[PDB]
Amino acid sequence: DLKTAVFNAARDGKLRLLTKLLASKSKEEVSSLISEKTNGATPLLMAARYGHLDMVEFLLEQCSASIEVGGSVNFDGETIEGAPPLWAASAAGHLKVVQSLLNHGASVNNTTLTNSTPLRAACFDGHLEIVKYLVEHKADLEVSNRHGHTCLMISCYKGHKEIAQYLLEKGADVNRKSVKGNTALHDCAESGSLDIMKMLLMYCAKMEKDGYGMTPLLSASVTGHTNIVDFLTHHAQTSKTERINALELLGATFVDKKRDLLGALKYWKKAMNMRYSDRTNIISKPVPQTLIMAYDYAKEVNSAEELEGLIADPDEMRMQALLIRERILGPSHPDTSYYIRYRGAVYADSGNFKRCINLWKYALDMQQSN
Template sequence: MEFKNVVFNAARDGKLSKLKFFLEHRPSTEVHELLRTRIQGATPLLVACRNGHFQVAEYLITKCKADIELTGSVNFDGEMIEDAPPLWVAAAAGHEDIVKLLVEHGANVNSTTRTNSTPLRAACFDGHLRIVMYLVDHKADVEIANRHGHTCLMIACFKGHYEIAAYLISLKADVNRKSGKGNTALHDCAESGSLDILRLLLNNGAKMDVDAYGMTPLLAASVTGHAHIVEYLITLSSVSNRERIEALELLGATYLDKKRDFMEAARLWGRALDERERVGLLKCPHRSLILAFENSEEIQTRSDLERTMADPDAMRMQALLVRERILGPAHPDTAYWIRYRGAVYADAGDIRRCINLWMYALEMQQLMLEPLSVMTQSSLLSFAELFAYMLNKGITGTCDIGGDMLGIFRSCLKELENAPKEEHGKMAYHKMLLITLHMACLLVEYFRPRKSAPRAVLASLYKLLKMNAKGRDGNGSLHLAVSRESSTIGRYPICSFPNRSLVYHLLDLGTDVDARNDAGDTPLHVAARNNPSHAELLHILLKRGAHPDIRNSQGKTFSQILWEQSKETVNLVPFVSLQCLAARVVKDRCRPACIPPHLVDFVNQH
């Protein structure tokens, strides 16, 4: 391994002479193996391409016959790019000479990363026009989109690279193509503030279409606060009076919340009111019936606006109402600012108002978004963090949150219950299961002073067990409850794992104490591996019937793992039955064919 590190470091640092010294006189098979070795995810050729060491790359390709399609992981701006081929890396880093070297030696110009990003898209991202033109000249496909459906033109527009966008359009790149979420290149321009490119797109047939959230490029510019884009688009004849007015109203909400410019927000809202009066499109009375909005009513007239300007909190509520009306309650921007406003109220000590706002946002997300949505999980995690903070600070007396906590726990169960079967065990499902278990811990902690949890809480915990939810690596609820790795879930600490109170409740409700994960580990194995100092936890599992002789897929019992981890032992005499002792003897001394079929599984556990 030390020799492999030397080769890797020499390639990374551009030390050609050192590389030749180590590789020149070695057998080709050994050289081949060294060049396929990944360190921190990358091969020697990949790091040479990443750092622009042309001579090293040329030597590895021409003399050492390095595989020019062998992928690996490289870091760009703090993001790890997985399964990146050398050509993608060189194009992304802007090393034109290495790009040409790779293509001349047969590199696939349309090779992709794990996210289906091509070398051409990588060059478009960082504005390397000469590389873009070279790759196109060598048959790069301008229409290959990444896994999200974003094309080379879209990313050039989003990053504001006018010359690349113009070049791609000259090649007849589809200016109206939609991504997986329905946005077009016009949306990308509006979000990034690239007015020159936006004009270019419109002059080449781009249409003002809507994305999956019903957002036009005009509304996208309003949400991101690009006033110059808004002012340009509202002059177009294709924009209706309503679209023009709503863009001004939404831009006002953005100025208020994002830029904290109350005066500009008021000016824009006043301008929208004047426009409504001018074209005869008066605002319909809109009083929110939602508890979270405290029956606030949108302003109707200039005099309403003037009164509202005297109350900053009322102005902020107007911004929420505007977003809810124009974008809809489940739009990410609407949900974000509802949650943000709730957090502000929580910081000011108004916990009830915070919970009401967050509850409303969560209800809309679960109604409108697919199960396991990142946004929904973020809302549920925020609730868990809030409740943990309240319990730690002992401020629950001023706000009885037992019912709220149970409601959020049930919302967690709803996400797990509605998740597609193919998502079970994947990262999103695993995270949702962890959030659910943290909420379960908080519930148990909240009701602990009352000696026993209410029937409704126990019923919800039992429902979790009946789901038989499995997280990453096939770990069930009890596996996760005894694992210290379950503690880390978000930015802020919530519950500490292993959690004995939760373990007791899961066992009382009948969870399988000997359930196995994909590695054949029972909760005993997990507890022994992750928490060797938690002897009490091991005794809890053993007293509740955990089988001490069960071996995992590696043939190890929990006590063997415990000894390897900490050189500690557990007195197993009180937990071993005569059946287990007999099974050990039978397994050691009897041929498998002599064991009755109905006892084979039991004997093999020992």
């Protein structure tokens, strides 16, 4: 009864309602009731989560004991486990509460069970003042989550140029790699954050293949951020062969993600003309080992004159898209099977269940083998 009404009172921010609940209880008894978890969370953690400053000051002044105790907090319908009060406050954008918990001695790099710092948390939803305040209170820029994703990486992915700028001038390492080889440049490519990408390149960020063998350029081609593809295909650090494959893959993404066939064809014609713009250095389309029944035994166009009529054969353009993606990403990259399945589902929507089944059969074989 009481231990719950205490939790509900701290969660909702009812400090008048709370005080009357403990009036005739001992400092011993109170330290117990505010110590106990409800819905996986301390009263202090909920007080901080929903930004009730008066409530935070009160609870700490009874017992500083729950300040580093992690628990369950909900952000965007997701539960997050092991989150201390300072982390929850930071995630939620409650600056005054962030300032109060640090005043009262809170540990500025104490993490969730995923090893996410309060700094990482503030970097996510883009709370610049909390970031600045955490860093001016000894927050480690370089503590990554358990996948090795950094504060600069998430800052880049969520398109917060100011926060990324502040981290960079405060000395953040731009060439860190996630366990799967993600760099901040890859985060820029996958979000279409062109300005941040340009900033990273002035801080001498190196473009590298990730664990899937994807450069920032190709990561942008997969996700269909044409702003990044246009920039990096005119950049000196990208070769003729890299531009051609990036244009062709972006072409496929236009077919499958954007359902824009005219746009796909523009990209394929550009890449095809690049392929035969020097008789001294012809870049020929690689021939795959075998024809695929699920692709109707189709073969990539290998000439400008083979592209011209393609607009009139949408089915041929969808098979070209799957060949291109399989050649450039390979079967280990999750988007290859994702788009095979998607294409199957589209045929099923037309009433072609057989073609759906044959594409899904080959997709499921590909997934099992990964």
